[PDB]
Amino acid sequence: TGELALEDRASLRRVAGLSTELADVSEVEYRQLRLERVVLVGVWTEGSAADAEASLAELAALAETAGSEVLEGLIQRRDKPDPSTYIGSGKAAELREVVLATGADTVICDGELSPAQLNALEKAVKVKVIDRTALILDIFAQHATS
């Protein structure tokens, strides 16, 4: 009753991190510039906020090296990520309008999700959901020569 997610302020968290990056001019190449703007999301259960920020920084570096460009650092906490959605219940509708201030329909989740989670969180925001392992595989696919 009045809890929605049945938790503390971990229920709803628009942390926004530290604004991982906010891209600008001097990288405008062709109509197809680096417009793959990505919003990161994660969950912080076992550890400290400093190491969670470090993990988000690592994910941001990975997404930046793999083309694309990060512009958000949300951290929403839940002891056990909803094995139905990765970030939460009301966050499903919340992200839909959160991504409207940004406008690139790409969300990257810091962790290995399962197909139910992928499709649920996708349909909840109408954007493309990308795993950390998927991003690493993309980096290898791009750098592989032999």
Partner RNA sequence: AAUUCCUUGUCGGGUAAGUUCCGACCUGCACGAAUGGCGUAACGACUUCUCAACUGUCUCAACCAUAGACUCGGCGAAAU
97: tokens are 């309008």
Question: How far apart are the C-alpha atoms of 133 and 136, rounded to whole Å?
Answer: 5
Nearer to RNA, 105 or 111 (CB): 111
Provide, for the chain, the percentages of residues in helix, strand and coil under a 3-state DSSP scheme, each rounded to the nearest 5.
35, 15, 50
Q: Least distance (Å) from RNA to the CB of residue 52?
A: 23
The answer to whether 84 contacts RNA (rule: CB under 7 A) is: yes
Q: Least distance (Å) from RNA to the CB of residue 6?
A: 7
Contacts of 10 (CB under 8 A, 6+ apart): 76, 77, 78
Nearer to RNA, 36 or 82 (CB): 82
Q: Least distance (Å) from RNA to the CB of residue 98?
A: 21
Nearer to RNA, 6 or 50 (CB): 6
